[PDB]
């Protein structure tokens, strides 16, 4: 949304004027982050952890 602005001074019985909410967008473009590891079954058995 646009910033808050200020109402306008007006005569009596006069037309109210427009300064409605104006809009824009912020983009996102997510990047894939990856991590991998491999362990042999014999390592998995033998390790203390």
Partner 1 sequence: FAASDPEYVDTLFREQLLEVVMEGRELRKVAREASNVINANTRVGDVPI
Partner 2 sequence: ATETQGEHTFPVEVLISGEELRGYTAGEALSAGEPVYLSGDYEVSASSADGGEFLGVNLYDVASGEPVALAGDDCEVRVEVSEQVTANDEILPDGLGTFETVATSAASAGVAIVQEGAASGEVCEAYIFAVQGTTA
> Binding site residues for Mg(2+), as ranges?
5-6, 15, 19, 35
Nearest of 1, 38, 36 to residue 21 by alpha carbon? 1
Least Å distance, CB 26 to partner 1, is 11
Length of the chain equals: 49
**Contacting partner 1 (CB under 8 A), which of 7, 20, 31, 43?**
20
Give, as ranges, the residues between 3 and 32 that touch partner 2 (CB under 8 A).
31-32
The number of CA neighbours under 13 Å toward the Cβ of 30 is: 3
Q: Which residues form the interface with Mg ion (CB under 5 A)?
A: 5, 19
């Amino acid at each position: 949304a646009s910033d808050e602005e200020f109402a306008r001074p007006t005569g009596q019985g006069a037309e109210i004027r427009d300064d409605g909410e104006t809009y824009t967008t912020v983009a996102w473009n997510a990047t894939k982050l990856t991590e991998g590891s491999r362990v042999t079954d014999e390592m998995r058995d033998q390790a203390m952890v």
